[PDB]
Short mmCIF file of all heavy atoms in Angstrom, two decimals:
data_model
loop_
_atom_site.label_atom_id
_atom_site.label_comp_id
_atom_site.label_asym_id
_atom_site.label_seq_id
_atom_site.Cartn_x
_atom_site.Cartn_y
_atom_site.Cartn_z
N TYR A 6 -11.87 34.53 -42.36
CA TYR A 6 -12.17 35.75 -43.10
C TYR A 6 -11.14 35.93 -44.20
O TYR A 6 -9.96 36.15 -43.94
CB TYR A 6 -12.21 36.96 -42.18
CG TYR A 6 -12.54 38.26 -42.87
CD1 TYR A 6 -13.81 38.47 -43.44
CD2 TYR A 6 -11.61 39.28 -42.95
CE1 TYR A 6 -14.11 39.67 -44.07
CE2 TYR A 6 -11.89 40.47 -43.56
CZ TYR A 6 -13.13 40.67 -44.12
OH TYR A 6 -13.37 41.89 -44.74
N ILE A 7 -11.58 35.86 -45.45
CA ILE A 7 -10.66 35.94 -46.58
C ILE A 7 -11.25 36.83 -47.65
O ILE A 7 -12.42 36.70 -48.02
CB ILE A 7 -10.33 34.54 -47.13
CG1 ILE A 7 -9.56 33.77 -46.03
CG2 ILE A 7 -9.53 34.67 -48.37
CD1 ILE A 7 -9.28 32.32 -46.32
N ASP A 8 -10.44 37.78 -48.11
CA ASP A 8 -10.79 38.68 -49.20
C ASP A 8 -12.20 39.25 -49.02
O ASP A 8 -12.98 39.35 -49.97
CB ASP A 8 -10.63 37.97 -50.55
CG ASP A 8 -10.64 38.94 -51.71
OD1 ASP A 8 -9.94 39.96 -51.58
OD2 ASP A 8 -11.26 38.67 -52.77
N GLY A 9 -12.53 39.61 -47.77
CA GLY A 9 -13.76 40.33 -47.47
C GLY A 9 -14.96 39.47 -47.13
O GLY A 9 -16.03 40.02 -46.86
N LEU A 10 -14.79 38.15 -47.09
CA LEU A 10 -15.88 37.19 -47.00
C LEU A 10 -15.66 36.29 -45.80
O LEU A 10 -14.62 35.65 -45.70
CB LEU A 10 -15.94 36.34 -48.28
CG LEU A 10 -16.07 37.11 -49.59
CD1 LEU A 10 -15.57 36.25 -50.76
CD2 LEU A 10 -17.54 37.53 -49.84
N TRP A 11 -16.66 36.19 -44.95
CA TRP A 11 -16.69 35.21 -43.87
C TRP A 11 -17.13 33.86 -44.42
O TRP A 11 -18.21 33.74 -45.01
CB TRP A 11 -17.63 35.69 -42.78
CG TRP A 11 -17.12 36.95 -42.13
CD1 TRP A 11 -17.48 38.23 -42.41
CD2 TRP A 11 -16.11 37.03 -41.11
NE1 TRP A 11 -16.79 39.11 -41.60
CE2 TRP A 11 -15.93 38.39 -40.81
CE3 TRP A 11 -15.34 36.08 -40.44
CZ2 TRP A 11 -15.02 38.83 -39.85
CZ3 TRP A 11 -14.42 36.52 -39.48
CH2 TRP A 11 -14.27 37.88 -39.20
N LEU A 12 -16.28 32.85 -44.28
CA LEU A 12 -16.52 31.50 -44.76
C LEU A 12 -16.05 30.49 -43.72
O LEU A 12 -15.05 30.72 -43.03
CB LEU A 12 -15.78 31.26 -46.08
CG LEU A 12 -16.18 32.15 -47.25
CD1 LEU A 12 -15.14 32.11 -48.37
CD2 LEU A 12 -17.56 31.73 -47.77
N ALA A 43 -5.16 30.53 -49.83
CA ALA A 43 -6.10 31.50 -50.37
C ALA A 43 -5.95 32.84 -49.68
O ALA A 43 -5.98 33.89 -50.34
CB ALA A 43 -7.53 30.98 -50.21
N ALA A 44 -5.78 32.85 -48.34
CA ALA A 44 -5.56 34.12 -47.65
C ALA A 44 -4.29 34.80 -48.14
O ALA A 44 -4.26 36.03 -48.31
CB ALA A 44 -5.50 33.92 -46.13
N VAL A 45 -3.22 34.04 -48.36
CA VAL A 45 -1.97 34.67 -48.78
C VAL A 45 -2.10 35.17 -50.21
O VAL A 45 -1.74 36.32 -50.52
CB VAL A 45 -0.77 33.71 -48.60
CG1 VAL A 45 0.48 34.32 -49.21
CG2 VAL A 45 -0.53 33.47 -47.13
N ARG A 46 -2.64 34.32 -51.09
CA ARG A 46 -2.80 34.71 -52.49
C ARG A 46 -3.70 35.94 -52.64
O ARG A 46 -3.44 36.80 -53.50
CB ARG A 46 -3.34 33.54 -53.28
CG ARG A 46 -2.32 32.46 -53.51
CD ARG A 46 -2.10 32.29 -55.00
NE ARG A 46 -0.87 31.57 -55.28
CZ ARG A 46 -0.74 30.28 -55.02
NH1 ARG A 46 -1.78 29.65 -54.50
NH2 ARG A 46 0.41 29.65 -55.26
N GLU A 47 -4.74 36.05 -51.82
CA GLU A 47 -5.63 37.21 -51.88
C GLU A 47 -5.00 38.44 -51.25
O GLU A 47 -5.14 39.56 -51.77
CB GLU A 47 -6.97 36.89 -51.21
CG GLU A 47 -7.81 35.79 -51.88
CD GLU A 47 -8.38 36.17 -53.28
OE1 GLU A 47 -8.35 37.36 -53.67
OE2 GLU A 47 -8.91 35.27 -53.94
N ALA A 48 -4.36 38.26 -50.09
CA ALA A 48 -3.57 39.34 -49.50
C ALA A 48 -2.54 39.89 -50.49
O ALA A 48 -2.38 41.11 -50.64
CB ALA A 48 -2.86 38.81 -48.26
N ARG A 49 -1.85 39.00 -51.20
CA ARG A 49 -0.92 39.43 -52.24
C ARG A 49 -1.62 40.30 -53.28
O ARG A 49 -1.10 41.36 -53.67
CB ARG A 49 -0.31 38.20 -52.91
CG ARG A 49 0.78 38.59 -53.83
CD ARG A 49 1.42 37.41 -54.47
NE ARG A 49 2.75 37.80 -54.93
CZ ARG A 49 3.54 37.06 -55.69
NH1 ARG A 49 3.14 35.86 -56.12
NH2 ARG A 49 4.74 37.52 -56.04
N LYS A 50 -2.79 39.85 -53.78
CA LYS A 50 -3.55 40.64 -54.76
C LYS A 50 -3.94 41.99 -54.19
O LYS A 50 -3.73 43.03 -54.83
CB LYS A 50 -4.81 39.88 -55.22
CG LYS A 50 -4.59 38.66 -56.12
CD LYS A 50 -5.89 37.78 -56.27
CE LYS A 50 -5.59 36.45 -57.00
NZ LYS A 50 -6.58 35.34 -56.73
N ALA A 51 -4.51 42.01 -52.98
CA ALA A 51 -4.91 43.28 -52.39
C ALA A 51 -3.72 44.21 -52.20
O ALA A 51 -3.87 45.44 -52.22
CB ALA A 51 -5.62 43.06 -51.06
N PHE A 52 -2.53 43.65 -51.97
CA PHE A 52 -1.37 44.48 -51.72
C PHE A 52 -1.12 45.47 -52.86
O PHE A 52 -0.87 46.65 -52.61
CB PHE A 52 -0.16 43.59 -51.48
CG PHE A 52 1.12 44.33 -51.40
CD1 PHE A 52 1.36 45.22 -50.36
CD2 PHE A 52 2.10 44.13 -52.35
CE1 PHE A 52 2.56 45.92 -50.27
CE2 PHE A 52 3.33 44.82 -52.26
CZ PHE A 52 3.55 45.71 -51.22
N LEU A 53 -1.27 45.03 -54.11
CA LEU A 53 -0.98 45.92 -55.25
C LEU A 53 -1.76 47.22 -55.18
O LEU A 53 -1.24 48.27 -55.55
CB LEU A 53 -1.27 45.21 -56.58
CG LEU A 53 -0.31 44.10 -57.03
CD1 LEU A 53 -0.44 42.82 -56.20
CD2 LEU A 53 -0.46 43.83 -58.54
N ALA A 54 -3.01 47.17 -54.73
CA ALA A 54 -3.80 48.39 -54.62
C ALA A 54 -3.66 49.07 -53.27
O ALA A 54 -3.67 50.30 -53.19
CB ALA A 54 -5.28 48.08 -54.91
N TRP A 55 -3.54 48.29 -52.19
CA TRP A 55 -3.50 48.88 -50.85
C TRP A 55 -2.22 49.70 -50.63
O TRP A 55 -2.26 50.77 -50.01
CB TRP A 55 -3.66 47.78 -49.81
CG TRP A 55 -3.47 48.22 -48.41
CD1 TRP A 55 -2.42 47.88 -47.57
CD2 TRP A 55 -4.32 49.08 -47.65
NE1 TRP A 55 -2.59 48.48 -46.34
CE2 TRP A 55 -3.74 49.21 -46.36
CE3 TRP A 55 -5.52 49.75 -47.93
CZ2 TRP A 55 -4.32 49.99 -45.36
CZ3 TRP A 55 -6.10 50.53 -46.93
CH2 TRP A 55 -5.50 50.64 -45.66
N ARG A 56 -1.09 49.25 -51.17
CA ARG A 56 0.13 50.05 -51.15
C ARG A 56 -0.01 51.34 -51.95
O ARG A 56 0.73 52.29 -51.69
CB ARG A 56 1.30 49.23 -51.73
CG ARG A 56 1.23 49.06 -53.24
CD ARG A 56 2.19 47.97 -53.71
NE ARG A 56 3.59 48.35 -53.56
CZ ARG A 56 4.24 48.99 -54.52
NH1 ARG A 56 3.60 49.28 -55.64
NH2 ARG A 56 5.50 49.35 -54.37
N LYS A 58 -2.66 53.33 -52.02
CA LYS A 58 -3.33 54.36 -51.26
C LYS A 58 -2.29 55.29 -50.66
O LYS A 58 -1.16 54.90 -50.36
CB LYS A 58 -4.20 53.77 -50.15
CG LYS A 58 -5.30 52.75 -50.63
CD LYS A 58 -6.33 53.34 -51.58
CE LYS A 58 -7.42 54.13 -50.86
NZ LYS A 58 -8.37 53.28 -50.08
N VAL A 66 -8.53 54.98 -42.51
CA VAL A 66 -9.18 53.73 -42.12
C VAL A 66 -8.72 53.31 -40.73
O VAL A 66 -9.52 52.84 -39.91
CB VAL A 66 -8.93 52.63 -43.15
CG1 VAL A 66 -9.45 51.29 -42.62
CG2 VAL A 66 -9.61 52.96 -44.46
N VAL A 139 2.87 40.91 -48.18
CA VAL A 139 2.00 40.18 -47.26
C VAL A 139 2.83 39.77 -46.04
O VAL A 139 3.89 39.15 -46.19
CB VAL A 139 1.40 38.96 -47.95
CG1 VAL A 139 0.61 38.11 -46.96
CG2 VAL A 139 0.49 39.42 -49.09
N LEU A 161 -0.12 47.59 -41.46
CA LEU A 161 -1.15 48.13 -42.37
C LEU A 161 -0.87 49.59 -42.68
O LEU A 161 -1.00 50.02 -43.83
CB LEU A 161 -2.53 48.00 -41.76
CG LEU A 161 -3.04 46.57 -41.72
CD1 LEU A 161 -4.46 46.52 -41.21
CD2 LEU A 161 -2.92 45.96 -43.10
N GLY A 164 1.36 50.04 -45.59
CA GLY A 164 1.03 49.53 -46.90
C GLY A 164 1.18 48.05 -47.08
O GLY A 164 1.21 47.58 -48.22
N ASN A 165 1.39 47.30 -46.00
CA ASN A 165 1.38 45.85 -46.09
C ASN A 165 -0.05 45.31 -46.01
O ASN A 165 -0.98 45.98 -45.53
CB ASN A 165 2.21 45.22 -44.95
CG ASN A 165 3.67 45.67 -44.96
OD1 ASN A 165 4.46 45.33 -45.86
ND2 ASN A 165 4.04 46.45 -43.95
N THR A 166 -0.21 44.07 -46.43
CA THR A 166 -1.42 43.36 -46.07
C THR A 166 -1.07 42.23 -45.12
O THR A 166 0.08 41.79 -45.04
CB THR A 166 -2.18 42.86 -47.30
OG1 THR A 166 -1.33 41.98 -48.07
CG2 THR A 166 -2.55 44.02 -48.14
N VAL A 167 -2.08 41.77 -44.38
CA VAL A 167 -1.86 40.94 -43.20
C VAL A 167 -2.67 39.66 -43.33
O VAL A 167 -3.86 39.69 -43.65
CB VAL A 167 -2.28 41.69 -41.92
CG1 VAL A 167 -2.35 40.75 -40.76
CG2 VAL A 167 -1.38 42.89 -41.65
N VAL A 168 -2.03 38.53 -43.03
CA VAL A 168 -2.73 37.28 -42.75
C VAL A 168 -2.56 37.02 -41.26
O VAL A 168 -1.45 36.74 -40.77
CB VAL A 168 -2.18 36.11 -43.58
CG1 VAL A 168 -2.95 34.85 -43.22
CG2 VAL A 168 -2.21 36.42 -45.07
N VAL A 183 -11.14 41.49 -35.97
CA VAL A 183 -11.21 41.58 -37.43
C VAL A 183 -12.59 42.10 -37.88
O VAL A 183 -12.69 42.82 -38.87
CB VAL A 183 -10.85 40.23 -38.09
CG1 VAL A 183 -11.10 40.28 -39.63
CG2 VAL A 183 -9.44 39.89 -37.82
N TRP A 186 -12.18 45.75 -37.80
CA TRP A 186 -11.44 46.23 -38.97
C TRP A 186 -12.36 46.33 -40.18
O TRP A 186 -12.26 47.26 -40.99
CB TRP A 186 -10.23 45.32 -39.27
CG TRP A 186 -9.03 45.61 -38.45
CD1 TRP A 186 -8.54 44.85 -37.42
CD2 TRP A 186 -8.16 46.75 -38.56
NE1 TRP A 186 -7.44 45.44 -36.88
CE2 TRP A 186 -7.17 46.61 -37.56
CE3 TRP A 186 -8.12 47.86 -39.40
CZ2 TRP A 186 -6.15 47.54 -37.38
CZ3 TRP A 186 -7.09 48.80 -39.22
CH2 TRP A 186 -6.12 48.63 -38.21
N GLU A 187 -13.27 45.36 -40.33
CA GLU A 187 -14.21 45.40 -41.43
C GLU A 187 -15.14 46.59 -41.32
O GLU A 187 -15.25 47.41 -42.24
CB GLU A 187 -14.98 44.10 -41.50
CG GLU A 187 -15.86 44.02 -42.76
CD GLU A 187 -16.55 42.69 -42.89
OE1 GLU A 187 -16.74 42.00 -41.86
OE2 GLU A 187 -16.82 42.30 -44.05
N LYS A 188 -15.82 46.73 -40.18
CA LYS A 188 -16.65 47.90 -39.99
C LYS A 188 -15.89 49.19 -40.27
O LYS A 188 -16.49 50.20 -40.64
CB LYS A 188 -17.21 47.93 -38.57
CG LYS A 188 -18.29 46.91 -38.26
CD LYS A 188 -18.79 47.07 -36.82
CE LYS A 188 -19.89 46.07 -36.45
NZ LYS A 188 -21.20 46.34 -37.14
N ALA A 189 -14.56 49.18 -40.12
CA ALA A 189 -13.77 50.38 -40.38
C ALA A 189 -13.63 50.70 -41.86
O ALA A 189 -13.19 51.81 -42.19
CB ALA A 189 -12.39 50.24 -39.73
N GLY A 190 -13.98 49.78 -42.75
CA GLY A 190 -13.87 50.03 -44.18
C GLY A 190 -12.58 49.58 -44.82
O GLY A 190 -12.21 50.12 -45.87
N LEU A 191 -11.87 48.63 -44.22
CA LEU A 191 -10.61 48.13 -44.78
C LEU A 191 -10.90 47.32 -46.04
O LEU A 191 -11.69 46.37 -45.97
CB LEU A 191 -9.90 47.28 -43.73
CG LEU A 191 -8.40 46.99 -43.69
CD1 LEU A 191 -7.57 48.26 -43.47
CD2 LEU A 191 -8.10 45.95 -42.62
N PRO A 192 -10.24 47.59 -47.17
CA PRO A 192 -10.57 46.88 -48.41
C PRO A 192 -10.39 45.36 -48.32
O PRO A 192 -9.66 44.84 -47.47
CB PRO A 192 -9.59 47.47 -49.43
CG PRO A 192 -9.29 48.83 -48.90
CD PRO A 192 -9.28 48.68 -47.39
N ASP A 193 -11.09 44.66 -49.21
CA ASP A 193 -11.00 43.21 -49.33
C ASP A 193 -9.55 42.75 -49.47
O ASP A 193 -8.83 43.22 -50.36
CB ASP A 193 -11.77 42.70 -50.56
CG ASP A 193 -13.24 43.10 -50.58
OD1 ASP A 193 -13.84 43.34 -49.52
OD2 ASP A 193 -13.80 43.14 -51.69
N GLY A 194 -9.17 41.75 -48.67
CA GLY A 194 -7.88 41.11 -48.77
C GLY A 194 -6.77 41.80 -47.99
O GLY A 194 -5.74 41.17 -47.72
N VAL A 195 -6.96 43.07 -47.61
CA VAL A 195 -5.97 43.80 -46.85
C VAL A 195 -5.77 43.17 -45.49
O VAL A 195 -4.68 43.27 -44.91
CB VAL A 195 -6.38 45.29 -46.73
CG1 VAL A 195 -5.38 46.04 -45.79
CG2 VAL A 195 -6.44 45.91 -48.11
N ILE A 196 -6.80 42.53 -44.94
CA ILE A 196 -6.61 41.74 -43.74
C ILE A 196 -7.35 40.41 -43.87
O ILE A 196 -8.49 40.37 -44.33
CB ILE A 196 -7.05 42.48 -42.48
CG1 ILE A 196 -6.43 41.79 -41.26
CG2 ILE A 196 -8.56 42.52 -42.38
CD1 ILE A 196 -6.64 42.56 -40.00
N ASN A 197 -6.74 39.35 -43.37
CA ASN A 197 -7.27 38.02 -43.56
C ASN A 197 -7.12 37.25 -42.27
O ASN A 197 -6.03 37.19 -41.70
CB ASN A 197 -6.54 37.34 -44.70
CG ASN A 197 -6.72 38.09 -45.98
OD1 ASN A 197 -7.76 37.96 -46.67
ND2 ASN A 197 -5.78 38.98 -46.25
N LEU A 198 -8.21 36.69 -41.79
CA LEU A 198 -8.20 35.93 -40.55
C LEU A 198 -8.17 34.44 -40.88
O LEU A 198 -8.93 33.97 -41.72
CB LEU A 198 -9.43 36.31 -39.71
CG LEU A 198 -9.69 35.54 -38.42
CD1 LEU A 198 -8.52 35.63 -37.45
CD2 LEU A 198 -11.00 36.07 -37.77
#
Side-chain angles (χ1 to χ4, degrees):
Chain A
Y6 181 66
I7 295 174
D8 195 46
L10 305 157
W11 295 97
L12 299 164
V45 173
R46 287 241 163 71
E47 295 292 347
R49 188 178 201 189
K50 289 168 189 157
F52 172 66
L53 288 72
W55 173 249
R56 73 194 291 270
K58 303 299 280 289
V66 172
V139 174
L161 289 185
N165 301 292
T166 59
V167 167
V168 179
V183 173
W186 278 107
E187 187 176 24
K188 288 182 180 290
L191 203 64
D193 303 335
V195 174
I196 197 172
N197 299 279
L198 174 58

